Design an enzyme around this catalytic site. Structure first.
Site, short mmCIF file in Angstrom:
data_model
loop_
_atom_site.label_atom_id
_atom_site.label_comp_id
_atom_site.label_asym_id
_atom_site.label_seq_id
_atom_site.Cartn_x
_atom_site.Cartn_y
_atom_site.Cartn_z
N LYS A 7 0.86 -1.20 0.00
CA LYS A 7 0.00 0.00 0.00
C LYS A 7 0.89 1.25 0.00
O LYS A 7 0.57 2.24 -0.69
CB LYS A 7 -0.87 -0.01 1.25
CG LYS A 7 -1.70 1.26 1.41
CD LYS A 7 -3.00 0.89 2.10
CE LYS A 7 -3.64 2.07 2.79
NZ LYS A 7 -2.99 2.34 4.12
N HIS A 12 2.71 6.05 -2.66
CA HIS A 12 3.79 7.03 -2.68
C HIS A 12 4.95 6.87 -3.61
O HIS A 12 5.77 7.79 -3.74
CB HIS A 12 4.39 7.00 -1.21
CG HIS A 12 3.30 7.25 -0.20
ND1 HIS A 12 2.66 8.47 -0.14
CD2 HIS A 12 2.76 6.49 0.78
CE1 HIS A 12 1.75 8.47 0.80
NE2 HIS A 12 1.80 7.28 1.39
N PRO A 42 -7.64 13.51 0.27
CA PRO A 42 -7.29 14.91 0.35
C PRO A 42 -5.85 15.31 0.15
O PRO A 42 -5.59 16.34 -0.50
CB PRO A 42 -7.80 15.37 1.72
CG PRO A 42 -8.19 14.15 2.44
CD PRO A 42 -8.07 12.96 1.55
N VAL A 43 -4.90 14.59 0.66
CA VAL A 43 -3.48 14.93 0.54
C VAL A 43 -2.66 13.69 0.25
O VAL A 43 -2.97 12.64 0.82
CB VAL A 43 -3.00 15.46 1.94
CG1 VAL A 43 -1.54 15.82 1.95
CG2 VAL A 43 -3.78 16.73 2.26
N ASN A 44 -1.65 13.75 -0.58
CA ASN A 44 -0.84 12.56 -0.83
C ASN A 44 0.49 12.99 -1.43
O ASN A 44 0.52 13.86 -2.31
CB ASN A 44 -1.50 11.59 -1.81
CG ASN A 44 -0.79 10.26 -1.92
OD1 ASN A 44 -0.69 9.52 -0.94
ND2 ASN A 44 -0.22 9.88 -3.05
N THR A 45 1.58 12.36 -1.03
CA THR A 45 2.89 12.69 -1.56
C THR A 45 3.51 11.55 -2.34
O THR A 45 3.53 10.40 -1.88
CB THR A 45 3.84 13.03 -0.38
OG1 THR A 45 3.24 14.13 0.30
CG2 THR A 45 5.21 13.45 -0.92
N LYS A 66 4.69 12.08 14.00
CA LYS A 66 3.78 13.12 14.48
C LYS A 66 2.89 12.56 15.60
O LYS A 66 2.47 13.27 16.51
CB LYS A 66 2.80 13.51 13.37
CG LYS A 66 3.38 14.21 12.17
CD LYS A 66 3.34 15.73 12.32
CE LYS A 66 1.91 16.24 12.10
NZ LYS A 66 1.71 17.65 12.56
N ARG A 85 -2.54 17.90 -3.30
CA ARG A 85 -3.57 18.36 -2.35
C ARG A 85 -4.82 18.80 -3.07
O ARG A 85 -4.78 19.51 -4.08
CB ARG A 85 -2.95 19.56 -1.59
CG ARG A 85 -3.60 19.87 -0.26
CD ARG A 85 -2.62 20.63 0.62
NE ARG A 85 -1.66 19.89 1.44
CZ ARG A 85 -1.86 19.70 2.74
NH1 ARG A 85 -2.93 20.13 3.35
NH2 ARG A 85 -0.92 19.12 3.46
N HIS A 119 4.38 4.05 6.15
CA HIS A 119 3.57 5.25 6.19
C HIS A 119 4.45 6.45 5.82
O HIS A 119 5.62 6.39 6.18
CB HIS A 119 3.01 5.67 7.55
CG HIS A 119 2.11 4.66 8.14
ND1 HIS A 119 0.90 4.34 7.53
CD2 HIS A 119 2.24 3.88 9.25
CE1 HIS A 119 0.30 3.39 8.23
NE2 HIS A 119 1.10 3.10 9.28
N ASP A 121 5.09 10.00 6.77
CA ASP A 121 4.81 10.91 7.89
C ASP A 121 4.79 12.36 7.49
O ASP A 121 3.81 13.08 7.78
CB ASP A 121 5.76 10.67 9.05
CG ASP A 121 5.10 11.10 10.35
OD1 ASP A 121 4.03 10.54 10.66
OD2 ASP A 121 5.59 12.00 11.04
#
Length: 124
Positions: A7, A12, A42-45, A66, A85, A119, A121
């Site tokens: 995933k 990413h 909503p947000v992804n890098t 975080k 975004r 993940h 971060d």
């Protein structure tokens, strides 16, 4: 259904390009990686480095996540990344994203054996 490591790769990793070349990159990639499937994420890098270079971050600078957990690692060097975004006007299923290309250090959460990224971060 999907392992945690698989995933992370799907959401990413984009080693096929050295950087996002157009303002439409995020709309294209968020859809082809199935991140607009049931909702608009909503947000992804996306990280534009080889998978081996990203996996190597799990053996770099250990820092807090975080959330306070301590299995996060910051890359020693900066990496080519693209932040995606949703815009103020995005509307499922007409997801719209703003593309922002940058070179920053990435922070990832690592787990398992082999110990790999699970993940994303943040980036600095």
């Amino acid at each position: 259904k999907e392992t945690a490591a698989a995933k992370f790769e799907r959401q990413h990793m984009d080693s096929s390009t050295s950087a996002a070349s157009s303002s439409n990159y995020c709309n294209q990639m968020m859809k082809s990686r199935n991140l607009t499937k049931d909702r608009c994420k909503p947000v992804n890098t996306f990280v534009h480095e080889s998978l081996a270079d990203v996996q190597a971050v799990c053996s770099q600078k250990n820092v807090a996540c975080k959330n306070g957990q301590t299995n996060c690692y910051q890359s020693y060097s900066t990496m080519s990344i693209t932040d995606c975004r949703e815009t103020g006007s995005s509307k499922y299923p007409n997801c719209a994203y703003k593309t922002t290309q940058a070179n920053k250090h990435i922070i990832v959460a690592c787990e398992g054996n082999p110990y790999v990224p699970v993940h994303f971060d943040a980036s600095v």
